[PDB]
Design an enzyme around this catalytic site. Sequence first.
Site, short mmCIF file in Angstrom:
data_model
loop_
_atom_site.label_atom_id
_atom_site.label_comp_id
_atom_site.label_asym_id
_atom_site.label_seq_id
_atom_site.Cartn_x
_atom_site.Cartn_y
_atom_site.Cartn_z
N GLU A 106 7.16 -2.90 -0.94
CA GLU A 106 6.30 -2.69 -2.10
C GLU A 106 5.74 -1.28 -2.04
OE1 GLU A 106 2.20 -3.32 -2.85
OE2 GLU A 106 2.62 -5.29 -3.73
N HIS A 107 5.45 -0.83 -0.83
CA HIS A 107 4.90 0.51 -0.61
C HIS A 107 5.91 1.64 -0.82
CE1 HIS A 107 0.85 0.07 1.55
NE2 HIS A 107 1.15 -1.14 1.12
N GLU B 262 -4.46 -0.31 5.70
CA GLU B 262 -4.92 -1.27 4.71
C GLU B 262 -5.24 -2.59 5.40
OE1 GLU B 262 -1.60 -1.47 2.03
OE2 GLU B 262 -2.31 0.32 0.95
#
Lengths: 443, 81
Positions: free
Chosen positions: A59-60, A136
């Site tokens: 996703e990153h 994160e």
Amino acid sequence: ATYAQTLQNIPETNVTTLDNGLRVASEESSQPTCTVGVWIGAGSRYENEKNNGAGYFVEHLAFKGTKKRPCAAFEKEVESMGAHFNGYTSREQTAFYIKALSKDMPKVVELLADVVQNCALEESQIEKERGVILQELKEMDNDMTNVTFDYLHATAFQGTALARTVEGTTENIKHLTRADLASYIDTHFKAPRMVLAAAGGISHKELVDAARQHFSGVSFTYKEDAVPILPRCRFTGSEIRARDDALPVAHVALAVEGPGWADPDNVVLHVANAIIGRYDRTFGGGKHLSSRLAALAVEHKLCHSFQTFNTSYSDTGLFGFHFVADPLSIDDMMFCAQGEWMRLCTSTTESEVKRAKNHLRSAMVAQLDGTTPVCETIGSHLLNYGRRISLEEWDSRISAVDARMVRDVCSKYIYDKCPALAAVGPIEQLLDYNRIRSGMYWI
Amino acid sequence: GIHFGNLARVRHIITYSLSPFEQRAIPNIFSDALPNVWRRFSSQVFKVAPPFLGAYLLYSWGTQEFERLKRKNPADYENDQ
């Protein structure tokens, strides 16, 4: 122009499938602006133990550039057309979508296609994002609510794939290989499992022609056309108590296995969760709030907030509630909460369901407050329910629900069931699984 | 009155438990239960048994001795007429 009618007026959602398997769907509005995206049927549930965290690492990178158009090339092209690109990755559903001028409808699809298919996966960037995700995590770890739901899954679905976090392990993030991210993409981001959805001022036909153009996947063997069926996740009446008397408030979440998207009871479950509702210290309502729990919460300063939930999944799900409280009112709160649950199974009143149904419809409508949300409903409906479900239908289904039905269904899923518990913080007051297990009956 | 909530300050301890209905009331009766019954027995028998075993003897002795002193000593009438 009564509500009923406005419902049967909303344009139908069109769906057309390609030879590769990709399913294109959309709801056309006059909106000058719009939203289009690809809703893949992949998540951390598809990941196994060795690659837990791939779909998130991936996703990153779906935004750091493709083979054709590298980093700046991508961003520049996208930033400069006043478009917003963004996405997410759940346990069993991943999504990537853009918010652009209905005008750019076709260039966007090209862009979407270029992301799900030709992600650069620049091994240089990979090592950077590795440090970002790791960062994160440090942050998300300070989100009690998250920690609490992850844990909830961690024990309710212990031993299965659904008991993993989406973000994955600190080890996997530290070691995943370009190759891993690579295959993840190849194995999951596949046509028959993806759904190109759009909403706004867009021609379904124009939409699908664009789809044909860049979403030109090929399928030779049967294997490719097939959608795998995941192994069933076993629910377990259990509890996980992560205690830290140093945190200000305590989080508590309790739940029972839910049916799954397909099951019609879900409607009834929602109507029920609609009765108990949710609360929070800034709800103007106050002592007069309709939800007894909320009301009780207010009268006794039982919690900084509470909320019911019915998290659905393909074959399973979690039906429960979560509350944040002070160390010394955790018990009274838990007590009252189970109280209302038992009341749901034994004495729901017609007046309650009436209010509940109205409140529900209202939420149902807010689920389609913009091209993006609408889009999200399409992508998900097709993905989950197979087809699209119109408010006119939902509304229909909802109306069928009545006290008796709520009680039967709730009894069915709640009464005398071994719940799953997750507690975090200064949780000494709330206690004993047994004492809580007995709260599951009589009411 | 209310004690649960004050008791003590604890941090960083996670615990996991399962509903009584997901598990067995009496499990691993051989692979685990008995082995420890023995373990325990073994470790305490040398602490307990001694004083009792001891008193036991003291019983027998004192009993038998009391009884012996009942019987007659022939040497008391071997000069008798």
